[PDB]
Amino acid sequence: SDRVLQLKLGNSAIVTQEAANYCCAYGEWPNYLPDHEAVAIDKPTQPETATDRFYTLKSVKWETGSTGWWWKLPDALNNIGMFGQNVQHHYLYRSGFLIHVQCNATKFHQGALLVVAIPEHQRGAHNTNTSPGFDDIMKGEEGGTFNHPYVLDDGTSLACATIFPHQWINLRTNNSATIVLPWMNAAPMDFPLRHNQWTLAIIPVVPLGTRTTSSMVPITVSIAPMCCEFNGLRHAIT
Amino acid sequence: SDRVLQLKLGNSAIVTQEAANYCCAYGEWPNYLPDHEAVAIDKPTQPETATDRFYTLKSVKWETGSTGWWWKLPDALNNIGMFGQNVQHHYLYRSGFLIHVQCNATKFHQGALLVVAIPEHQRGAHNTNTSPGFDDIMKGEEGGTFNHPYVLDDGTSLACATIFPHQWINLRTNNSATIVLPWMNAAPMDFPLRHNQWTLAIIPVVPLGTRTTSSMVPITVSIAPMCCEFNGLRHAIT
Amino acid sequence: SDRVLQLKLGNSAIVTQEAANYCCAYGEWPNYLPDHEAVAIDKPTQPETATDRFYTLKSVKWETGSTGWWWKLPDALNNIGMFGQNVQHHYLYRSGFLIHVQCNATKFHQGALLVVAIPEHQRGAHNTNTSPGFDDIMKGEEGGTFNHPYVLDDGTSLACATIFPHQWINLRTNNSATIVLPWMNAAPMDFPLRHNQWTLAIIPVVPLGTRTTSSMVPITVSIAPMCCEFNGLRHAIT
Amino acid sequence: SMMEINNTESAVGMERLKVDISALTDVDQLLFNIPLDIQLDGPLRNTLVGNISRYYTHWSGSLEMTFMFCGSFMAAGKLILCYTPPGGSCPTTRETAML
Amino acid sequence: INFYKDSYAASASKQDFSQDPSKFTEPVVEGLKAAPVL
Amino acid sequence: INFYKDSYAASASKQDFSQDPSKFTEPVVEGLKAAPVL
Amino acid sequence: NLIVPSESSDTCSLIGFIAAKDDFSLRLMRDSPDIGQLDHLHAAEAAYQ
Amino acid sequence: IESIIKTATDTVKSEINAELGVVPSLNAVETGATSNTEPEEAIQTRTVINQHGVSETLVENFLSRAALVSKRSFEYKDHTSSTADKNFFKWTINTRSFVQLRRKLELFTYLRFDAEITILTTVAVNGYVGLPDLTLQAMFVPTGALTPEKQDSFHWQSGSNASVFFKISDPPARITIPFMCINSAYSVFYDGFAGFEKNGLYGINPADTIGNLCVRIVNEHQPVGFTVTVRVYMKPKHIKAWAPRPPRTLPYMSIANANYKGKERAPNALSAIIGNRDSVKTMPHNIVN
Ligand SMILES: CC(C)Oc1ccc(C(=O)Nc2cccc3c(-c4ccc(CN)s4)ccnc23)cc1
């Protein structure tokens, strides 16, 4: 049962043979906006399979000195495929996300990644009064690296980060993690270029180690937007 | 009726041919802790006849100059038999007590002992601001002697001590006293090594006298723990 | 099913992820002594969770030259915890036992331990007419070593020892063994200091071997007394 | 939430959230102990139960400690984890803690 | 008059006229008679 | 006691005892068993 | 013992976690000693300007 | 599953187990679920009927107590020569200035509540004449309304702003402000930028802007100076809370951001949140007898 999984969305599918169940954030599932919660009165476009499909980001190398990695949503996808085109042509966006994180190694490797989805991960800067600037936050498809993962770069606590939706990749146990994120905002829709609802954080709480011959151990991130809606059609900001 | 008594608990029995009825403290009888009052969730050990039996302490000599004697419970029994072993291996204890005090003399002797069980007999020191130390309080099996029985060693009153559960041994009338003590604590169980629920006090309000040839007139104390329960098994403090 | 096991008795629990079912000796389960088989007429103490819990002995190192190890019951437990205290204060004892033997190694190790519970394992001496002395038999908590495991140190046969309640730890297959022993005596109760009902024998019929880097491979023994009863309370022999 | 069990000098940042275990050559050795004081500073303080509880003065009820083994698939081993009710010193030997 | 939400805020409860003085005056297991007591 | 015309003027509402801790403790799509979880 | 083959790392890690059970209760609210300030924060004054 | 919980759960008695294939003490943390092992499964238990209430940890009770949000002292005097709060001040309303309230609020991602506001005023003579029983005016100035420039400016005529007039001899002035976000909840944290250009503020949701509190002394100045201190207390009420967060560990640096430095050494250093012990085998407060 819990160990094998197939995810199919649009023209894309993923199989894993070493899942550890999967997380639905706060027990919710993505849905479209109902009429009794709607604000914008124009008829939304709902592209379905053109947007609601897995996009794969660039892989990152797991190293002995890694501090961990982060990507902000929708920012990381705002330039990718038909999701990106709808983002650029529309004032308002709403979606959930399906996050699938991939990392495999041999039975002689050890290491543990915390895979945590943080809502409203407002970052702090270290050792300054000046707030983080636009280019510190808006990393896009490449994402960022943690400066001080021990405090989640926000004066807080890695140890208590399990309060957020999460899984672990413990290389002994499993080689993938899956989190389903609902829409998570104070408004029913948002401008996708100035606010990120979710941050995916991948942090190596136990470092990668082995005594076999070393290999590159990549971590790969695949994200499917779910139930995408767009409102306020205009020219592309792009 | 009221003059003869047999007490049987476990492998032990006592007979007296000169009782003066007996006291049940505040009209209660010992019982085990019911589920609606219980706090500690581990299953208690209830050793029954291994603990719930008479233990006899060392006798004390009644003399013309005696001020009276005291023993603290459970402290006096904490090193005796299987009661002591369960005390040493368990964090929490609860029990009642059966107290039987023995003193006989001839029909030409006179003397009266107040036998009183005092709950929470917090002692004072005489003529100092410093509180009584550990070795002033924790006398164990040997017990202590009253310094100023007239104020019960606590700035109070022997005369009003009849407000506590008590009997008298008036040598003309009777030669034994019996008091049954329930569990008497603000908590449902306690740590037996740092708190004493009860103090047995034996005070010679009328001194021993005769004009026959003198003999040693001992006072002997036999105490049966009743309904013993122990919780929080670990290694022995011992 | 048969591969994973949890044992819970009192405040103690053991889990194994590589069991090989478990043995109930002769298909019996431990029970208390019924009235129609009882001899001693005093009311027994039944301490339950204070005695009926796993005690862990000192581990032994498995080596290339090992002949095997033995422990006698109740002798090995007669000085441990509240079981030992009840043993020392009571003339008569009765119980069953739960035996759990633990030994793990890598998937590159090989070796097979016969884990056998022998009733009335009356030992012989080698090459003498003189019977084994008290200190040859009564090893206590430390146990003994086999001199000639091939004849079970009693002029008999390791090969036929499978007639007794047993399991194997074959390092390829499993890493623990479990045997449940009923009371096994000609009398309904016994004096625990002069007679052993059961001997646990652990014998390496296939020696430990590997070509990985060597590690210490310990064997660990955990025994829970079951349905303990004690009769004939007195002072502790201790 | 993770306990900061390795609250030692020379454990920095993330390193404080894990305990490293090695193969030993002596039987039944002690690996670590955990102070159970939530009020005094210790491995339990910066935890979700810890931080919320420190807004309060009185507490009751059971705790669960969960340990995740993060060695390789080929690593094997057995540990014994003991809770000792209060009254004496922290046990330093396995056959004391086992009680 | 008590408009507070916690019941411990209320005024004093001076209505409990139950007594049992025998738990201090007569804690003997066999009750006295009105008749030689010993 | 609330004589104001706006309902937000009222005193605090301390009566909501509904909990669902499983949305933080058990957000797994297939529920745990009391039984090997993986 | 911890037993590993040559190609595994010789040293392994535990992560310990704690939680309360649902029999758990808290009482008598107080100021937590986990946070404090000796000064005004940066830009707290600027809110008056 | 959602249920009404008024007291902590009962414990049931449990027996010896020894069942093959059943391992309730084993778990898989990698799923992200918390351990479901019950006490009855780990040890033998008795029955306990549990009467402990849980009402003091209700979110309403945890947050609905009044905390200081603003504190301003100003000179009440003839100000013609001053360069200063000239018998009035303006405060831009925020919850980030006093750390005790800030840390409690920041346990959550979203909050919806009405704000009970209590205004406490105290006065001292400048270096005695007795203390004047002054009248104060507090005026709420929403976004886009004009703030007063002077103690006696015509903005204080308050045609449509809400004002409260209160004496120093009165009990503290008190009013409730409704939940006034343009969204369904306040954003306690905001991973976003306030404007359509790139230079807007990070970390503050424009949707949560309250406005300004303007407080003047209504009396003309006396011949002698006084120092007046105004304290503002806020109590959240009618609270909803969503998405609990890991608490703040490092000291706050700024009201504008989450920036962090840590203490110089543990506790609450950036390298070490918990204070050190000599080893993982050292028990710091070990009982010895
Ligand atoms: C003059 C009088 C008639 O009206 C008033 C009006 C307002 C005040 C005053 O200080 N309120 C306040 C002080 C501090 C905070 C607030 C809040 C907040 C909710 C969430 C926040 C995060 N950003 S902030 C909302 C409304 N108010 C607040 C005092 C008096």
Tab-separated table of N, CA and C and ligand atoms in Angstrom, chain H residues 67-70 91-96 101 105 111 113-119 137-141 161-166 175-181 186-188 204-205 208-215 232-236, ligand 1:
chain	number	residue	atom	x	y	z
H	67	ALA	N	-2.718	43.944	26.357
H	67	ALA	CA	-1.279	44.150	26.346
H	67	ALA	C	-0.940	45.538	25.821
H	68	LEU	N	0.154	46.091	26.332
H	68	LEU	CA	0.635	47.394	25.894
H	68	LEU	C	1.079	47.370	24.430
H	69	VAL	N	0.503	48.253	23.619
H	69	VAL	CA	0.898	48.399	22.229
H	69	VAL	C	1.577	49.732	21.955
H	70	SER	N	1.301	50.765	22.738
H	70	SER	CA	1.899	52.061	22.477
H	70	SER	C	2.154	52.790	23.787
H	91	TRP	N	0.650	58.631	16.367
H	91	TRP	CA	1.199	57.281	16.329
H	91	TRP	C	0.637	56.478	15.159
H	92	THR	N	1.525	55.927	14.332
H	92	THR	CA	1.146	54.964	13.299
H	92	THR	C	0.935	53.586	13.927
H	93	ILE	N	-0.311	53.121	13.928
H	93	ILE	CA	-0.733	51.971	14.720
H	93	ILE	C	-0.062	50.692	14.228
H	94	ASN	N	0.525	49.937	15.155
H	94	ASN	CA	1.145	48.653	14.853
H	94	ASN	C	1.126	47.762	16.093
H	95	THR	N	1.302	46.460	15.875
H	95	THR	CA	1.414	45.485	16.957
H	95	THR	C	2.832	44.969	17.192
H	96	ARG	N	3.841	45.530	16.533
H	96	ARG	CA	5.177	44.944	16.513
H	96	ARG	C	6.149	45.555	17.520
H	101	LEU	N	3.439	40.816	23.372
H	101	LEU	CA	2.314	40.673	22.458
H	101	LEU	C	2.755	40.200	21.080
H	105	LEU	N	1.238	36.860	19.073
H	105	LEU	CA	0.534	36.988	17.801
H	105	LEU	C	1.223	36.209	16.689
H	111	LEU	N	-4.985	35.881	11.679
H	111	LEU	CA	-5.833	36.200	12.815
H	111	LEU	C	-6.964	37.112	12.370
H	113	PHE	N	-9.854	39.324	14.440
H	113	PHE	CA	-10.352	39.738	15.750
H	113	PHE	C	-10.736	41.211	15.752
H	114	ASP	N	-11.631	41.549	16.670
H	114	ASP	CA	-11.900	42.912	17.101
H	114	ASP	C	-10.935	43.317	18.216
H	115	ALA	N	-10.597	44.604	18.255
H	115	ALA	CA	-9.612	45.158	19.186
H	115	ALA	C	-10.263	46.038	20.260
H	116	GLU	N	-10.282	45.560	21.499
H	116	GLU	CA	-10.631	46.391	22.650
H	116	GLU	C	-9.439	47.260	23.049
H	117	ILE	N	-9.601	48.579	22.972
H	117	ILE	CA	-8.528	49.542	23.214
H	117	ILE	C	-8.773	50.268	24.531
H	118	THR	N	-7.780	50.244	25.412
H	118	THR	CA	-7.807	50.963	26.679
H	118	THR	C	-6.674	51.982	26.711
H	119	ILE	N	-7.011	53.239	26.989
H	119	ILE	CA	-6.056	54.345	26.996
H	119	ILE	C	-5.849	54.831	28.425
H	137	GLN	N	-7.907	64.555	24.050
H	137	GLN	CA	-8.629	64.062	22.884
H	137	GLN	C	-7.759	63.064	22.137
H	138	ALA	N	-8.250	61.841	21.993
H	138	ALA	CA	-7.731	60.891	21.020
H	138	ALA	C	-8.619	60.895	19.781
H	139	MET	N	-8.003	60.965	18.602
H	139	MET	CA	-8.720	60.925	17.332
H	139	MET	C	-8.112	59.865	16.419
H	140	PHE	N	-8.958	58.999	15.878
H	140	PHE	CA	-8.534	57.996	14.913
H	140	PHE	C	-8.570	58.581	13.505
H	141	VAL	N	-7.423	58.570	12.833
H	141	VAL	CA	-7.278	59.103	11.481
H	141	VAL	C	-7.030	57.941	10.530
H	161	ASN	N	-14.156	61.853	11.648
H	161	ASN	CA	-13.320	60.957	12.429
H	161	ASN	C	-13.991	60.632	13.761
H	162	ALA	N	-13.772	59.415	14.241
H	162	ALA	CA	-14.112	59.060	15.614
H	162	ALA	C	-13.076	59.639	16.576
H	163	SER	N	-13.542	60.410	17.548
H	163	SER	CA	-12.744	60.931	18.646
H	163	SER	C	-13.330	60.493	19.979
H	164	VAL	N	-12.463	60.277	20.958
H	164	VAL	CA	-12.877	60.129	22.347
H	164	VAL	C	-12.200	61.206	23.197
H	165	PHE	N	-12.992	61.891	24.009
H	165	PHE	CA	-12.505	62.863	24.981
H	165	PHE	C	-12.570	62.242	26.371
H	166	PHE	N	-11.478	62.339	27.121
H	166	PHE	CA	-11.381	61.669	28.410
H	166	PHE	C	-10.530	62.500	29.359
H	175	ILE	N	-12.614	51.819	24.084
H	175	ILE	CA	-13.428	51.659	22.884
H	175	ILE	C	-13.065	50.332	22.225
H	176	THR	N	-13.993	49.795	21.440
H	176	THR	CA	-13.711	48.656	20.573
H	176	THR	C	-13.609	49.103	19.122
H	177	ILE	N	-12.575	48.640	18.438
H	177	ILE	CA	-12.473	48.741	16.986
H	177	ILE	C	-12.828	47.392	16.377
H	178	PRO	N	-13.671	47.349	15.354
H	178	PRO	CA	-13.984	46.078	14.700
H	178	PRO	C	-12.786	45.540	13.930
H	179	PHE	N	-12.853	44.250	13.615
H	179	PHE	CA	-12.016	43.669	12.577
H	179	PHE	C	-12.165	44.450	11.281
H	180	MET	N	-11.097	45.098	10.829
H	180	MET	CA	-11.213	46.098	9.778
H	180	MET	C	-10.308	45.823	8.582
H	181	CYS	N	-9.742	44.623	8.478
H	181	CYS	CA	-8.973	44.223	7.308
H	181	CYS	C	-9.839	44.197	6.050
H	186	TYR	N	-6.301	39.189	9.093
H	186	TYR	CA	-5.005	39.850	9.080
H	186	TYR	C	-3.912	38.861	8.700
H	187	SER	N	-2.921	39.347	7.969
H	187	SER	CA	-1.695	38.605	7.689
H	187	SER	C	-0.657	38.934	8.752
H	188	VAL	N	-0.471	38.026	9.705
H	188	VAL	CA	0.551	38.218	10.729
H	188	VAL	C	1.945	38.164	10.108
H	204	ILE	N	4.956	43.596	4.895
H	204	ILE	CA	3.747	44.199	5.453
H	204	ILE	C	2.637	44.101	4.418
H	205	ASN	N	1.543	43.451	4.772
H	205	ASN	CA	0.405	43.385	3.868
H	205	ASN	C	-0.315	44.728	3.882
H	208	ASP	N	-3.726	45.201	5.793
H	208	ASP	CA	-3.864	45.256	7.241
H	208	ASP	C	-3.622	46.644	7.829
H	209	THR	N	-3.550	47.688	7.007
H	209	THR	CA	-3.314	49.048	7.494
H	209	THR	C	-4.475	49.558	8.346
H	210	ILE	N	-4.188	49.923	9.592
H	210	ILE	CA	-5.204	50.449	10.501
H	210	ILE	C	-5.365	51.963	10.342
H	211	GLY	N	-4.275	52.725	10.412
H	211	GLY	CA	-4.327	54.177	10.378
H	211	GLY	C	-3.471	54.856	11.432
H	212	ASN	N	-3.847	56.054	11.863
H	212	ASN	CA	-3.101	56.795	12.871
H	212	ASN	C	-3.961	57.117	14.078
H	213	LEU	N	-3.342	57.047	15.248
H	213	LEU	CA	-3.901	57.569	16.483
H	213	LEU	C	-3.263	58.919	16.796
H	214	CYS	N	-4.077	59.962	16.847
H	214	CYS	CA	-3.639	61.301	17.214
H	214	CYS	C	-4.210	61.667	18.578
H	215	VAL	N	-3.337	62.036	19.508
H	215	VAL	CA	-3.716	62.383	20.872
H	215	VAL	C	-3.197	63.777	21.181
H	232	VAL	N	-1.300	52.870	25.550
H	232	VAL	CA	-2.385	52.213	24.824
H	232	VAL	C	-2.296	50.702	25.010
H	233	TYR	N	-3.406	50.094	25.422
H	233	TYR	CA	-3.530	48.651	25.582
H	233	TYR	C	-4.518	48.091	24.571
H	234	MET	N	-4.168	46.962	23.974
H	234	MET	CA	-5.033	46.275	23.031
H	234	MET	C	-5.355	44.873	23.540
H	235	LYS	N	-6.635	44.520	23.546
H	235	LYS	CA	-7.053	43.142	23.793
H	235	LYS	C	-7.757	42.587	22.556
H	236	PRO	N	-7.202	41.600	21.849
H	236	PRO	CA	-7.983	40.887	20.821
H	236	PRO	C	-9.211	40.189	21.401
I	1	LIG	C1	-9.573	57.633	18.971
I	1	LIG	C2	-10.500	56.461	19.252
I	1	LIG	C3	-11.945	56.900	19.094
I	1	LIG	O1	-10.306	55.433	18.309
I	1	LIG	C4	-9.160	54.626	18.392
I	1	LIG	C5	-8.830	53.840	17.307
I	1	LIG	C6	-7.716	53.019	17.384
I	1	LIG	C7	-6.928	52.998	18.525
I	1	LIG	C8	-5.730	52.052	18.543
I	1	LIG	O2	-4.684	52.381	18.954
I	1	LIG	N1	-5.963	50.735	17.998
I	1	LIG	C9	-5.015	49.656	17.811
I	1	LIG	C10	-3.778	49.494	18.427
I	1	LIG	C11	-2.993	48.400	18.062
I	1	LIG	C12	-3.445	47.501	17.097
I	1	LIG	C13	-4.703	47.698	16.444
I	1	LIG	C14	-5.262	46.808	15.515
I	1	LIG	C15	-4.566	45.635	14.863
I	1	LIG	C16	-5.094	44.379	14.456
I	1	LIG	C17	-4.039	43.596	13.687
I	1	LIG	C18	-2.891	44.413	13.491
I	1	LIG	C19	-1.614	44.011	12.752
I	1	LIG	N2	-1.248	45.115	11.883
I	1	LIG	S1	-3.113	45.842	14.190
I	1	LIG	C20	-6.453	47.097	14.933
I	1	LIG	C21	-7.197	48.201	15.326
I	1	LIG	N3	-6.683	49.016	16.265
I	1	LIG	C22	-5.451	48.752	16.817
I	1	LIG	C23	-7.271	53.764	19.620
I	1	LIG	C24	-8.392	54.570	19.546
